[PDB]
From a paper:
BR187–385 crystallized in two crystal forms of the space groups P43212 and P4122, with differing unit cell parameters. Single anomalous dispersion (SAD) data, collected from a seleno-methionine derivative of the P43212 crystal form that diffracted to 2.25 Å, was used to solve the phase problem. Three BR187–385 polypeptide chains were placed in the asymmetric unit, and refined to R- and Rfree-values of 18.6% and 21.5%, respectively. The structural deviation between the P4122-BR187–385 monomer and each of the three P43212-BR187–385 molecules was minimal, with root mean square deviations (r.m.s.d.) of 0.6 Å and less than 0.4 Å, following superposition of the P4122 monomer on the P43212 chains A and B/C, respectively. Crystal packing analysis revealed that two symmetry-related molecules in the P4122 crystal formed an intermolecular β-sheet resulting in an interface area of 585 Å2. The same interface was also observed for chains B and C in the P43212 crystal form. We believe, at the present stage, that the formed pseudo-complexes are probably owing to crystal packing. In conclusion, the crystal structure of the BR187–385 monomer takes a compressed barrel fold with one face formed by an extended and twisted β-sheet, and the other face mainly consisting of well-ordered loops.
Numbering used by the authors: 204 to 377
Amino acid sequence: IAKSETKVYTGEGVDSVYRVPIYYKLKVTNDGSKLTFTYTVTYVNPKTNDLGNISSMRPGYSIYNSGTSTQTMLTLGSDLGKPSGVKNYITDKNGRQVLSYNTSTMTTQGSGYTWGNGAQMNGFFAKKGYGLTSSWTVPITGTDTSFTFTPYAARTDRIGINYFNGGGKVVESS
């Protein structure tokens, strides 16, 4: 008898340049041995599956989905171990991988973790309904599997303007 539990979190912010919604999705699966995290930033509204406005973003515009050490992405409860590397890739509308980027190194900053700059997405993809996706695992060693995740998106120049604020924290207790 294998058992697992999955939560999907979604939220929304504002791209300052194009004045459009920008969205994130975070899927977290707990199978008893580890938490698997999948984090996607996209212009496709997860509620409707409709792509945002309006064709008028240039192809070489580009965004990151992780801050560097401008901000902590992830904090972990007492019975979660060290996160793996963070795989980075572009996903299509159905979440299947289109191409892959360098795997990032998860490091500690502050009370939690970040990974640093690695992948980006450019209008040439955002406009196809694609997302910029990162995934990693964290071992479970006991009962306190709480965590918080803070989403991030910014154009590759000007790393300081997080499109999500970033006051849109995901907080899971235990």
